[PDB]
Design a protein around this ligand. Sequence first.
Ligand SMILES: CCCCCCCC/C=C\CCCCCCCC(=O)O[C@H](COC(=O)CCCCCCC/C=C/CCCCCCCC)COP(=O)(O)OCCN
Lengths: 71, 83
Amino acid sequence: ASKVKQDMPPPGGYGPIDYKRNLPRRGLSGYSMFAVGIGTLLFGYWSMMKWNRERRRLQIEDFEARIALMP
Amino acid sequence: AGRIASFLKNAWAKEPVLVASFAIGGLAIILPSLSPYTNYAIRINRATPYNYPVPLRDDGNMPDVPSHPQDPQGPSLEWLKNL
Ligand SMILES: CCCCCCCC/C=C\CCCCCCCC(=O)O[C@H](COC(=O)CCCCCCC/C=C/CCCCCCCC)COP(=O)(O)OCCN
């Protein structure tokens, strides 16, 4: 006298299954990104300004060495 | 006063690339005319000795011309090393 055994869902039911789209925001604001970009640009401009002025002075020194050696 | 603001808003909403290009180009045009460092750049370019400085024949009444490179007379580059 064996009872019926068959593939059935568990008593109660199965757990919920997600189906809706899940695309989070995961980002900053436009103002923040623009601000960081401009800040990086300004820092780079300042550094290159100092470096290029120093390079101009070094080139002047090299040219003076050449001038002293020319005669 | 009110039309230009709406036009700029529409342009920023629709063509941000063109707005950025026009802003950057306008800044490139205007800013050099309002900067005190343009004269300094001209002076730096003038300070570079590409050719030999030919000496002058001492005629006897040129006080401002130096007789030695280390003499106090002549152009000074002290403004440059502090820049
Ligand atoms: C003052 C200095 C100017 C000179 C420097 C400029 C540097 C280079 C930039 C110019 C390069 C040539 C650009 C070509 C012009 C494009 C004209 C055009 O036809 O654009 C239209 C669109 O219309 C427009 O012209 C865009 C809006 C208006 C132009 C952009 C804004 C104008 C200037 C804004 C910046 C000014 C200063 C910033 C203000 C700061 C806030 C106070 C294209 O649309 P479609 O191809 O038909 O699209 C089809 C698909 N839907």
